């Protein structure tokens with residue numbers, strides 16, 4: 001079933017229930033996921049209205065871009081030309097600049113395919129918006145099906161050569177309570193290397209480092225507490241995880257990551273080369289989610305994209321987008337129950 | 347009474363009915379007026395869904411900007427520096443360039459004051475959007491009251507020196523049907539001068555012309571057909587009216603123009619110095635409004651703003667907006683019925 005209602009400020013809430021009874025909801029404010037529940041329990045973090053997003057934190061569950069992450073000094077080179085983008089984090093351009101796409105009302109249309117329901121959000125980034133050459137016609141399609149798969153399909157075409165590398169900023173918290181840390185969740189991640197940050201400004205260091213057999217090695221499932229309790233420099237620097245992980249094997253067919261808690265697992269598939277993981281290292285900020293003060297480590301993201309830093313480390317990729325060339329990216333989050341035995345205590 | 351409903355593509359339709367039974371409706375798609383009707387008749391032109399605006403004509407009823415009108419070569423000088431804006435009509439920048447503020451969904455809040463209801467729409471234009479320096483935080487408040495006054499109040503703040511001169515683009519048609527020409531309406535307008543156009547490109551010619559005692563003198567009520575049947579080169583050039591008229595006396599208290607058809611009249615008030623009047627000179631285009639094929643001259647606008655062409659005729663004014671200054675503008679359309 002599909003249901004729609006006003007969500008505040010002119011945005012709407014689109015809520016779907018599949019045949020298994022799982023419900024998921026989105027809003028056109030930032031083409032974002034608001035909630036995902038199973039048996040009355042929240043699997044992700046979200047607010048109860050639009051204003052909350054605008055007043056507390058506008059990134060959760062949103063579509064962010066045109067470029068996700070930080071671009072050092074907001075400088076990119078596009079077809080031999082240097083362009084300076086909007087700098088909203090010191091000299092850095094973070095998640096596309098200020099008042100970016102995650103803050104806009106996108107138009108949308110819903111398509112019911114029976115076993116699958118699609119929500120296609122559209123927006124146009126005018127040429128020159130926040131310094132990005134355009135115009136860029138973008139669309140984000142979120143779909144949910146009877147197999148409990150939530151898929152995000154991105155498409156974009158630009159009138160001018162530009163850069164494009166958006167991602168989805170959902171936060172998972174299988175505890176269903178923001179006040180409960182994710183340290184008790186199990187993580188499996190198919191990545192042997194990571195990208196270290198230079199310092200507190202969080203720009204990339206310049207190197208790629210192998211993490212095998214360190215507390216950041218999750219090729220084999222381990223509790224998140226291992227990472228959180230680590231005194232590895234990188235962990236101390238950010239007070240948790242806030243890094244890009246390079247996937248070892250590319251392809252939409254491979255389970256790149258799996259997040260488990262008791263009998264629930266979330267699997268991650270994507271066609272992108274990296275996964276930026278940030279564990280809500282907010283300290284005592286205590287943002288209120290459903291009236292629960294969020295704890296430090298009270299959430300975890302899986303931002304699938306080309307790794308941030310390619311400006312400095314060319315080996316990570318190329319996010320340029322040529323005029324008229326069609327961009328596409330697909331990321332899928334699927335839910336399962338009893339995929340494995342996960343019985344621990346913290 | 348206030349009613350909110352889906353208007354398509356995620357846009358909302360907000361309808362306000364006052365004590366008098368008059369209904370006015372707006373959409374956040376482009377902070378726009380969609381309808382205005384008394385005793386079952388539409389007073390303005392509008393569509394029945396969001397899609398139509400996007401497919402047919404996105405300007406009707408909309409808030410247009412940042413700059414209303416045509417800018418020659420898309421060129422503006424800011425702090426002595428040349429800036430090229432998006433060009434969407436040949437080399438001109440018309441109505442802020444392509445995919446401008448009129449095609450975006452604005453956020454909004456409704457405030458019910460009893461005798462008056464206000465709908466405040468907001469949108470942030472990012473720095474660099476379509477070539478315009480910013481960011482510009484804008485709000486347009488459309489309000490409707492028990493006295494049948496529809497007021498538009500604009501406010502904006504920019505982080506950087508920029509240009510700003512928006513307008514409301516509603517088209518009136520008291521016939522209540524687009525297939526009927528407004529030639530039968532009577533118009534009165536408090537302007538003794540106008541800005542002629544250079545040619546079919548519609549950029550300004552360069553001068554200011556006195557219209558006293560010409561077919562465009564509406565200082566004294568007159569019927570539209572007059573202007574429409576004139577042989578003035580300017581009328582013939584565009585096949586109607588598509589020009590900036592310079593108000594003789596500025597101030598919101600003065601009735602600047604009045605559009606009348608029989609018992610029903612529309613008065614216009616503004617704090618702007620000019621009114622751009624365009625009579626839907628679309629020829630055979632035939633756009634469909636409520637299933638009715640539109641006729642050449644099947645509508646008329648009253649675009650209150652600083653006249654277009656200031657880039658070439660400074661006397662017209664200046665649309666500069668300095669960083670941190672607060673822009674304000676007010677335009678009122680008051681409805682009256684003779685008893």
Ligand SMILES: OC[C@H]1O[C@H](O)[C@H](O)[C@@H](O)[C@H]1O
Nearest residue numbers: 059069094242276278301303
């Ligand atoms: O809260 C936004 C969040 O977005 C990304 O995950 C960044 O890596 C984090 O450092 C933080 O900026």
Ligand SMILES: OC[C@H]1O[C@H](O)[C@H](O)[C@@H](O)[C@H]1O
Nearest residue numbers: 405415548588589622624647
């Ligand atoms: O249709 C848009 C409309 O906008 C303004 O009124 C112009 O002066 C008219 O020529 C026309 O372009």
Ligand code: NA
Nearest residue numbers: 012356357358
């Ligand atoms: Na809506």
